[PDB]
Amino acid sequence: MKTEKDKMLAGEMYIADDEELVADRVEAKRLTRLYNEAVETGDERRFTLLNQLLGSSADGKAQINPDFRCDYGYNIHVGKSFFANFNCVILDVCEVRIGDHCMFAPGVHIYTATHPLHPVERNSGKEYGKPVKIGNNVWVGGGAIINPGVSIGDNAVIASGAVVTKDVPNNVVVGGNPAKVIKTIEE
């Protein structure tokens, strides 16, 4: 009864080469190529293309620099005034929810996709994911990595190069690998 896609979204083990998911991934790549060319050449149709790619954006005017990459596109949901700089990658096998006024520097990667640590299970043709949630007014610094299952609170700032393995509270700066609070933001 459950499709592989149902399992995927639920965070359960799913067959990555399921017919439907494969078609979704190849379609995401084709559309993504068109989008990246639109934004590189500065065509206004970049917004229409992006709005077909992303699951949703609050204002339909998400500003994403090239070359953007994502797995499905449709699991990505952004608030108002979303900005991502060059070469961001979002593996949205599970939901990636991003709030308002969020800002990604270049090379930010968000992963929801993951695998079993044990070889037989990892090699079985099945994998899984954990959703990522990012609050309002989050600034993610250059080259940062947001790992699966992570939530980032409102007004948090992720230092460049940070590797985020655990939830980030409201109003802090985190930095390092693994990322740790390096400062509290007052107000």
Determine the interface stretch with its own copies among 4-12, 51-59, 141-149 (rule: CB under 8 A).
141-149
Give least dist CB 1 to its own copies, A.
Answer: 27
Closest-CA residue to 140 (of 171, 110, 103, 165): 103
The residue range among 7-15, 52-60, 82-90 that interacts with its own copies, by the rule CB under 8 A, is 82-90
**Contact call for residue 155 and its own copies (CB under 8 A):** yes
What distances in angstroms separate CA 1 from CA 5, 16, 23, 75, one per listed residue?
11, 17, 20, 22
Instruction: Based on the shown chain and the rule CB under 8 A, indicate whether residue 14 belongs to the binding site for its own copies.
Output: no
Residue 115 falls in the annotated catalytic set: yes
| In the complex, minimum distance from the CB of residue 33 to its own copies, in angstroms, rounded to a whole number | 5
179: Cβ contacts below 8 Å, ≥ 6 apart: 158, 159, 162, 163, 164, 165, 166, 168
| Cα gap 98→150, rounded to integer Å | 12
Distance CA 43, CA 152 (A): 33
Single residue of 3, 51, 85, 151 touching its own copies by CB under 8 A: 85
- In one-letter notation, the amino acid at residue 172 is V
Q: List own/partner pairs for 114-118 with CB under 8 A and 24 or more apart.
A: 114/148
Q: Which residues bind its own copies (CB under 8 A)?
A: 26, 29-30, 32-33, 39-42, 65-67, 69, 81, 85-87, 89, 91, 101, 103, 105-107, 109, 111, 113, 115, 117-120, 122-123, 136-137, 139, 142-143, 145, 147, 154-155, 157, 160-161, 163, 173, 175-178, 183, 185, 187
